[PDB]
Structures are given as C-alpha cells and as structure tokens.
C-alpha cells in the first residue's frame, strides 16, 4: 500500500501443505521497508520467470 507518498511493504515466509486454495489458520505479517517515493499508483502487474 501507499499512504501519503510512503510506500509500505509487509511480508513473511512460512511452510504449508497446500491441500486446498488457502489454509485455515492465522499468522501475522511483519514490516519489511518503507519507501518515501511520493507518487500516485492505481494499477499493478506481476512478473514471472
């Protein structure tokens, strides 16, 4: 997300056993960085190998 120009990121890493679409559980996501870029964003797209 991007709030007042600051672009914030939160993430983690965990193992799973992907039996279904997603797991029924709980786990919090820690912060990673906070960039004071200062632009408008309205769209995005993924990059694959």
């Amino acid at each position: 997300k991007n709030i007042d120009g600051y672009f914030k990121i939160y993430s983690k890493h965990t193992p799973i056993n992907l039996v279904r679409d997603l797991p029924q559980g709980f786990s919090a996501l820690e912060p990673l960085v906070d960039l004071p870029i200062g632009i408008n964003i309205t769209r995005f797209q993924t990059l694959l190998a």
């Binding site: 007042d4 120009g5 600051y6 004071p36 870029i37 200062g38 632009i39």
Partner: protein, 49 residues
C-alpha cells in the same frame, strides 16, 4: 555578413586577471514539493545515561 558560430572558446590563462581567470561555480538548487522530504542535515547525539 551577420552570421557567426555562436559558441566561443574561453581565454582562461595564467596571464588572465582575477576578473578573467576561471572559477568553478556550483549553484545548489533546492526543492520543497508535496512529495516527502528525502534530504536532511546530519543529526547529533550523545552518550547514554
């Protein structure tokens, strides 16, 4: 007639005077936009009590 190459070389020389010797000029521009502040001065500190 009334047609000259606009760019002209300089006479920067040891023979030149104070008003004609070269001077490395640096104009330091600043910007205060709605975008966030990214450059700041150095902060101080002290020991821990």
């Amino acid at each position: 007639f009334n047609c000259y190459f606009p760019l002209q070389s300089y006479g920067f020389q040891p023979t030149n005077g104070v008003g004609y010797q070269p001077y490395r000029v640096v104009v330091l521009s600043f910007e205060l936009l709605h975008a966030p502040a990214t450059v700041c001065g150095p902060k101080k500190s002290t020991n821990l009590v």
